């Protein structure tokens, strides 16, 4: 087969910058190369076809170039909605795609909004207590959540995950859930999540008392 190599795997820039993505084929593909953009949860979207032809409806700021084995996609003025993974595809031989280049943006610091959710009556009835802490729309991505029960720092009972970068404001959100059996849950009073982030002068704590709602 003809194998496609994309570089770099992760590309970081800022709004307004010029970004160039690389795609090299293991052998000549004679301009038979297309470019797609894919966002989380969506099908790939055609941007450039036959090396340098702009797909209808695609912003003029996208352009393709190359020949032989070496190709590039260029975005002339990065916009927030350009954050995505970009794939190249050759169709000289049997179709093959590159492994993709992921684009992310730096923007000004934005402090998280912090929210906490007591366990559901439904879930408690099933014998488990999940407490959820939400950190909404912040930047940079690095954010430390610490669970404290009666002000004692927890470990081993929580899981978190972060969103892809937002298409409009370039921020991230973060969800953290602490899970205890209902028996362990009913052993303590105060459940708190404590958030540290570049955007916060000092830790922000949101908490509730078990049984209060």
């Amino acid at each position: 087969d003809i194998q496609m190599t994309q570089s770099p795997s992760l590309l970081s820039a800022s709004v307004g910058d010029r970004v160039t993505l690389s795609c090299k084929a293991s052998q000549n593909i004679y301009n038979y190369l297309n470019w797609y953009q894919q966002k989380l949860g969506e099908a790939p979207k055609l941007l450039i076809y036959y090396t340098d032809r702009l797909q209808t409806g695609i912003p003029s700021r996208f352009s393709g170039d190359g020949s032989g084995s070496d190709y590039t996609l260029t975005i002339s003025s990065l916009q927030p909605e350009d954050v995505a993974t970009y794939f190249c595809q050759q169709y000289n031989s049997r179709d093959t795609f590159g492994a993709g280049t992921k684009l992310d943006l730096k923007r000004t610091v934005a402090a998280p909004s912090v929210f906490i959710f007591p366990p559901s009556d439904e879930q408690l009835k099933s014998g488990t207590a999940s407490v959820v802490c939400l950190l909404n729309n912040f930047y940079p991505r690095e954010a430390k959540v610490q669970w404290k029960v009666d002000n004692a720092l927890q470990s081993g009972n929580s899981q978190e995950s972060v969103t892809e970068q937002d298409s409009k404001d370039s921020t991230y959100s973060l969800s953290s859930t602490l899970t205890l059996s209902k028996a362990d849950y009913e052993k303590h009073k105060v459940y708190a999540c404590e958030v540290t982030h570049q955007g916060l002068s000092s830790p922000v704590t949101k908490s509730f008392n078990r049984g209060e709602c």
Partner: protein, 228 residues
């Protein structure tokens, strides 16, 4: 305008068969090449098979040749992919895509459906409300959501108010629990002033276990100066 919509998918035991379909509108597969492309973590995008506009010609990747069969029903304006003797290596999201000629690009794609090949049993999600309250309010905005716990395999699909609510929605990547089961949360921020009049319902779909859940999420009273 053109649209491709796929159907089918779910969890299948190794060795077993599954069939996918792709329904077209705004175009006919009598004038286009129907292609199947699959995507899985660590394997990017991978071309699987195609059938010609005149339907006389089928092509397959080495890895699926002899197990997979592509077909069409021009009456239904629909294409199919019969998958036989599935292996775990086949686990992926499967897309249909059209190209006018073999040298044209894939300009229209289906939405993707997931095929999971596993010996493990499916498990439907438990859906619990993340209720708005003073504790999930910040300024004039309230957060609310749903916690989708203890399901297998991925994925679960979440919408809000049947798709009418998308602004400020954050559906997070699932996490892997030590039990092998999966969990995820979906949240929305809305005006805190809207909690008394607006209804918020999370629509949770888990194809592998044939489950669809609509969970109404309602406000709780959590504001106390003194805890009894």
């Amino acid at each position: 305008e053109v649209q491709l919509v796929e159907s089918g998918g779910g969890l299948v035991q190794p060795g077993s068969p599954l069939k996918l379909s792709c329904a077209a509108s705004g175009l006919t597969f009598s004038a286009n090449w129907l292609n199947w492309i699959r995507q899985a973590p660590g394997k990017g995008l991978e071309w699987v098979a195609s059938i010609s506009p005149d339907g006389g010609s089928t092509s397959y990747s080495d890895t699926v040749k002899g197990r997979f069969v592509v077909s069409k029903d021009n009456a239904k304006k629909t294409g199919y992919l019969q998958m036989n003797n599935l292996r775990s290596e086949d686990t992926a999201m499967y897309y249909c895509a059209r190209r006018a000629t073999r040298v044209s690009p894939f300009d229209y794609w289906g939405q993707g459906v997931t095929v999971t090949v596993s010996s493990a049993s499916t498990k439907g999600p438990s859906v619990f409300p993340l209720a708005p309250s003073s504790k999930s309010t910040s300024g004039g905005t309230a957060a609310l959501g749903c916690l989708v716990k203890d399901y297998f395999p991925e994925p679960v699909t979440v919408s809000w108010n049947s798709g009418a609510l998308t602004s400020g929605v954050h559906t997070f990547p699932a996490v892997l629990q030590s039990s092998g089961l999966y969990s995820l949360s979906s949240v929305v921020t809305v005006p805190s002033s809207s909690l008394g009049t607006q209804t918020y319902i999370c629509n949770v779909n888990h194809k592998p276990s044939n489950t669809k859940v609509d969970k109404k999420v309602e406000p709780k009273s959590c504001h106390h100066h003194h805890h009894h």
